[PDB]
Give the backbone structure.
Amino acid sequence: VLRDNIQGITKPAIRRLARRGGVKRISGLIYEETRGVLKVFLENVIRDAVTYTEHAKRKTVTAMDVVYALKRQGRTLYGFG
Amino acid sequence: LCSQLDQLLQVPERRKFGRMKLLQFCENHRPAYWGTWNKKTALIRARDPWAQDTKLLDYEVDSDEEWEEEEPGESLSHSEGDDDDDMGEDEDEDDGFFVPHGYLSEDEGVTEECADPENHKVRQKLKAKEWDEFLAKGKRFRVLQPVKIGCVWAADRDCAGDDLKVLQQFAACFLE
Amino acid sequence: AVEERVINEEYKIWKKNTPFLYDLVMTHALEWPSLTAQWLPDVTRPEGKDFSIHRLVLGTHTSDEQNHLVIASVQLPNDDAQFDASHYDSEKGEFGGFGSVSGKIEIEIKINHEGEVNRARYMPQNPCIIATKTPSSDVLVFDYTKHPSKPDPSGECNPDLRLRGHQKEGYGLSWNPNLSGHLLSASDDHTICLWDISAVPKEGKVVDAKTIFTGHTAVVEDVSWHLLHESLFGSVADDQKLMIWDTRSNNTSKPSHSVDAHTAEVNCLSFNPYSEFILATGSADKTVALWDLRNLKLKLHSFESHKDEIFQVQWSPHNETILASSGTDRRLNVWDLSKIGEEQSPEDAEDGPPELLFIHGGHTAKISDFSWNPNEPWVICSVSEDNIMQVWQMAENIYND
Amino acid sequence: ARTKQTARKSTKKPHRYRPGTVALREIRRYQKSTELLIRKLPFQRLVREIAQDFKTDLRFQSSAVMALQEACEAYLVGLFEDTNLCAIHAKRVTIMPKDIQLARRIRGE
Amino acid sequence: MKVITCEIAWHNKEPVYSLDFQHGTAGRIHRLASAGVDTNVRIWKVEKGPDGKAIVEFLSNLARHTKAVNVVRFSPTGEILASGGDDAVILLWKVNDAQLNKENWTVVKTLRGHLEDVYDICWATDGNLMASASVDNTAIIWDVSKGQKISIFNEHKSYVQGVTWDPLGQYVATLSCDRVLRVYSIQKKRVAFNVSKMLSARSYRMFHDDSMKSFFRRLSFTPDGSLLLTPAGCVESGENVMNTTYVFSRKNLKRPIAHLPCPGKATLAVRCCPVYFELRPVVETGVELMSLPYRLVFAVASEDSVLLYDTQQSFPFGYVSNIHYHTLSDISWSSDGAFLAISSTDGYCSFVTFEKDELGIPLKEKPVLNM
C-alpha cells in the first residue's frame, strides 16, 4: 500500500524546476532520472540526519540535524543556520 | 512658449572589454547568446552593415550545427505547463508534522525537568515566533544598512544622547 | 522566389554581422502581424532580480480570425547585470557564454477586437485607458483593468466606450499629453474628428463627435497633438499638405495655417518631446522634411535616405535631436541633428548623406510600427508584416563614440 | 492607398574565483525564496516512507521538512546550471541524462 | 575604532568558521588563518594601510583536507598551527624554509582521537598540551611533543562546542550542548566542577538547549585566568528566558559572579584579548566586573553582534551590529590587540581597526601567572 509514491513527483513541479534553472528544451525520459537523483540525495541527507539525531540521543529530528547533514555532504543553508 | 510659437507661426578587465552584449532570435534552435564583443574591423560599419568581414569570421550558418534539436523537447518555451496545477487532500493524524503536534510528540517522547506550565508557555512562545515569522515573510527582500556605535565612555558627557540611551538599553544586570 | 531568396540571404548576412553592430537584439515571431506597437511608461524592477520588465500594446491582423488587442510584458536584463564577469571562452577570447537564462516576451491580456486594430494609443496619463481604431466606422476604447485578462469566449468584442463622428476606417489616432480625454482621429472620410472622453459618464458607451475638421481635400493620413501646446495640433494627408489647426479657432473648416508638404503624399508627423518648434513629416517621395514652426514656408531640412515611401516617423524621449523613420524599404534609419552640415569622405558617402547615423534592415517584411522606449534609451521594438517582432538596440559606440 | 499582402500562417569545471577582486553581493541568494513550487504532500509522504524504511518511532517538524525541501531544489538548481554549462560545452541544447551524470561527477558525488 | 567589512574573496564564498592571529610576533604585521568548508586553509597577511584601514592579502593555502574544517587556532607561540576538519583528524603544521602560495606550510604532527567532525580545539598555556572538541561528545587530551592521545572524557550526553585551557594550567572547562557545564582538573583528570541548573528559589538551567540555531558555543579563559566566561546563557527573569553570558571567578565556579544579558540575538563565541591595560580612571563603584590591578578587554560574539567590555565597565563600550548578513562564526584578537578579526557564516569576514592607545596603555611588564 504505502510503497508506490516514486512518481509522486509531479510533471508540473519538474517542469517548474526546469523553468527556474533557465532551460527551454527538456528530455522526456529525464524525469525519472531526476526523481532518482532526488531520491538518492534525499536518502543520503535523511540517513545522515538520523545519524546525528541518534548521536544526539534524540527521537524527533530537528532541522539542525538537517543543517549538519547539509554541511557534511557539503552545501550551505541560508537564513536558518 | 505657446504665445511665441503662435506669433512666429503666423581574466582581463571588464572595463577593458566594454559593455555586455546580448542577442536572441526566436527562430533559432540555437540558444540565445550573451557575450562581450571586442573585435575591431573597419569593414563592418553602420553605413554598410552587410559588407564582407574578411579575416574576421565565416559567413556560414552555425545555428543548425549548434542545435539540431530533432527531439521531444515538449515545447517548454511557452503556452503549456505553467498554468497547470493539481490539488489534493491528505491525512495528518498518525504522525503529526505540525508545530503543536510536533511539540506534543517531543514532550511525550522526551521528558525533562521542566514544569508543565513552563512547557505550555514555551510552546506558546515558539508558536508565536513561528506566526510572526510567517507574517514577516511578506517583507521579502529588505536592503539592510550597517550600524556602528563608536567608543562612547562615561567620562564624556558631550556625546550623542541617542547613542547613550541605546547603550543604556543594553545594561548589564547584576544579581545579588 | 528570387525576391524571397535575396531577402533571406540579406537577413542571413545581417544575422551574421549583427554582433559587431548591435548591443541588444530580442526577436520574436508573432502569431499574427500587428499594425500597432507601443511601450508602457511603467517599468517593473523587482528587488533581488537581475532584470527589468517592460510592457507592450499590440494588435493582430487576422484575415478570418477574431482580432485580439494584446498586451505583452517583456523581460529585460538589468543595468547592474550589464556588468558581470561570469566566464571566459579561450576560443573567442571574450567573456562570452551562450547560456540559457535570458529575458523573455510574454503576452499578458488579449481583448477581442472588431476587425484589425488600425491604430492603438493610450492615455499619456493613464495606461489603463487605450484607444483603438477599427476597420468599421466605430472607434473602441478598452481597459485591461476593466476587462478579464483572457479574451472573452464570445467572439464579439466588449468595448468600454465607442466614439462617433467618422464614417469609415482610418489610420490616424492621437492623444493630448496636456489635456485629458482629447482624441484626434483621421479617416478616409476626409474628416478629422476631435473627441473628449473626460466628460463621458461612467455608464456611457457612445461618444459623439465633439469637433470635425474638413479642411483637407484628401485622405487625412495622420493627426497628432502638440507635445507642449495645449491647443495646437497638426495634420498630414494624401494631398501633400501640412496643415495646422488651433482648437481655439472658431472655424473647423478654415485651418490656422496651410503649407504644402512635398510633391508626394505624406503619411505621419512627429514633434520633439523636448522642443516645440520643430516637427518631422515623412512623405512618399523618399524624403523626410524638417519644418521649423517659426517659418513653415521653408523646410528646415529634407533628409533623403529611403528608396520608397516612408510610413512612420518618431522622435526620442531620451534625446532631443534624434529621429528615425521606417517605411516599405524594411529599413529603419536613425538620424541625428548633430551631424547636419558635416563634411564626410565619399567612402562614408556612397550609402547616402551623413545626416544618417544608423540603418536597421532586420525586417523580412515591411516595418509595420515602432516606438522608442521612454525609460530605456536607444531601446526600440519594431514589427514587420510577417508577424515578426524584435526588440533591438544598436552598438553604443555608434552614438556615444 | 497602399498595396497590402495576405499574411502567411506562422508555425575549469570548478569555477572557483580568485581570492582578490571578488566583491559579489548577491542578496537574493541569502534569503529563502518562500517559493516552494513543489507539492508539499507527495514530498512529505515520500520522506515519511523512506524514514520508516530507515528507522521507526520517530517524528519530524514542519520546519525540518521544509528545510529538506529547499535543500532539494537548491541542489537541483546547482546541478541544473551545471548541466546547462556542460551541454553548452557539449555543443547541444537538449538535455541528456548523461549530462546530469557528468555534472554530478564534476562535483564528485 | 573603525569597522571594515571584508568584501574580498575569503573562501570563494564558502562560509568562515574559525580564525586566529599570530601570538608569537608582537610586530604590527600579522599572519591570519581561516576555516571554511572549501576544505581549504588560507593564510592571509594583514596590516593597517596608510589610511589606517586593515588591508589584507593572501599568503598560503592548505588543501589536504578531505572534509570541511571548523576550528583553527595557532599555538601561543604561533609557530605551529592546529588544523581541524570534518574528516575526524587534526594535523599540526609549521612553515617550511606554489604559484599562488608565497610560502609552504607543512604538516608536522598527525593527531587523531576524535573519529567524528570536530568543533573546537584548545592550546595549553605553553602550546605543548592540546585540547579539542568534536561531535563525538568526547573530551580528549593530547601531548604536542609526542603527538599521541593521553586522556578521554566521556561524561557528556550531547555535543560539546567549546573547550578552553586554564592559563594557570589547573583547569579545563568544557560545555555540553545539553545546557551542562563541566570543569576538569589537570592532575585529577576528572570533573572538578559541573553546573547545569541554578536556584534563584526556583531552579532552572542557565544555558540554551539544542533548539538554538547556532552551530558553535565557543568561549575562552581570561588570559589572567581568574575570570571564566560562558556564552549562550539563559536568564528567566519572568515567565520568559533571555539570552546572556555568565562570568565566573576562581572563587566559585558554581555560582557565576554575574551575567551580561544580550537582548535579541544569542551569544555563541567568547574571546579575550591577550594584552593587558592600565586601570582606566573611573569612580570607585561596583560597575567593574572584577577589581584587578591591571585591566583587560575582551570581545563577545553573539548571533549577529559583537560587543566590547573591559575590566572596569559593565555596559559595553564598543558596540557593532548589522554588518554580516548571516550569523557570526568566529572572533579573533590580534597579538597587539589592534586588529579584531570578525568572521561570520555569510561567507565574508570583517575587521575593526584599533588605534594605538585607544584601549589604554599596555602594561610595560606583563604580570606573571602563578602555575
Summary: Residues 110 and 118 of chain E are 15 Å apart (CA to CA). Chain E touches chain D through twelve residues (CB under 8 Å). The first strand of chain E starts at residue 2 and ends at 6. Residues 2-353 of chain E form a domain with the Methylamine Dehydrogenase; Chain H fold (CATH 2.130.10.10).
